């Protein structure tokens, strides 16, 4: 345990509810509040990309299909999608944008490709996830009012789902290596896991920030000469600053390397 004491202390010190799940890909198990629901924030974007890649694999979608869009469609935080109001972007470029930059319009453009939030939930069930749901678009989905089940996962379901997508058989080998490559190229989660992550280890991750103090991260990590580990760490319902909240998720992720 003792990684258990750190989580319990973080809840008591920060007034937060924490969810942690780790999956060793192994014959090991654990988790803290791992079947409670947490707001996904921008970690859902890994799932929407896997959803879209699954449609490509079925011949139902084209990664090179160009989406042309307008500026009333831009939602706050569009670091990439704003620079391409003129030419548009391909679906592949959009996927890259949401995983790499957490660009919110690219996410919405992918959700629209899939058929909306209700359709991502249907993919998730199709790949075995009975709990995780997406219900809104960016940025409404980060509202995270406590007790609301919209736009939620559980640490157990999210760790399981990421495994089925990244290492399981839900996606093609080409799609997995695309998603993994995007996650290894993530740029907005720096200190939460990567920073305390030893050199020589590979991490692909995706992080979320959301209202009511929501902070989340999902990650596949390859220790040196070991099977990958899937981690899902969520924190919410706290009034701490983004600083103490970042430092606790990093402190939980550090304890996991032990």
Author numbering: 27 to 51, 54 to 286
Paper text:
The TEM-1 β-lactamase model system has been extensively used to study protein evolution. β-lactamases are a class of enzymes that are produced by bacteria in order to provide resistance to bactericidal β-lactam antibiotics through hydrolysis of their core β-lactam ring. We apply EVcouplings to computationally design variants of the model protein TEM-1 β-lactamase. To examine the structural effects of these mutations, we obtained X-ray crystal structures of designs 80.a, 80.b, and 70.a. Aligning these structures in 3D to a published WT TEM-1 structure (PDB: 1XPB34) revealed that all three have nearly identical Cα backbones to WT TEM-1 (0.26–0.61 Å RMSD over all Cα atoms).
Most notably, the 70.a design, which contains 88 mutations relative to WT TEM-1, had a ~32-fold increased MIC of the monobactam β-lactam antibiotic aztreonam, a 16-fold increased MIC of ceftazidime, an 8-fold increased MIC of cefazolin, and a 4-fold increased MIC of cephalothin. All of the designs that enabled resistance to ampicillin in the biological assays had a similar catalytic efficiency (kcat/KM) to WT TEM-1. This includes the 70.a design with 84 amino acid differences relative to any known protein. We also searched for local structural changes by examining differences in all pairwise distances between residues, which showed small changes in a one looped region for all three structures (positions 255–257) and in a second loop of 70.a (positions 53–55). The G251W mutation, which was present in both 70.a and opt.b, stood out due to multiple studies that describe it as negatively impacting fitness in WT TEM-125,51. In the 70.a structure, new local interactions between mutated residues W251 and R230 and non-mutated residue E212 may contribute to maintaining β-lactamase structure and function. In summary, (1) 70.a contains many point mutations that have been described in the literature as compensatory, (2) these mutations combined with G251W have some of the highest predicted fitness effects, and (3) structural analysis suggests that local interactions between W251 and R230 (a mutation in 70.a F230R) may be important for maintaining function. However, the other functional designs contain amino acid changes that exhibit fitness defects in WT TEM-1; 80.a has two amino acid changes that show fitness defects, 80.b has four, 70.a has 11 and opt.b has 28. To investigate the structural basis for the increased Tm (80.a had a 24 °C increase relative to WT TEM-1, 80.b had a 18 °C increase, and 70.a had a 6.3 °C increase), we tallied the total number of hydrogen bonds and the number of atom pairs in contact (1.7–4 Å) in each structure. There are five shared mutations near the active site that are in three designs (M69A, E104T, P167T, E168A, E240G) that may contribute to this increased resistance.
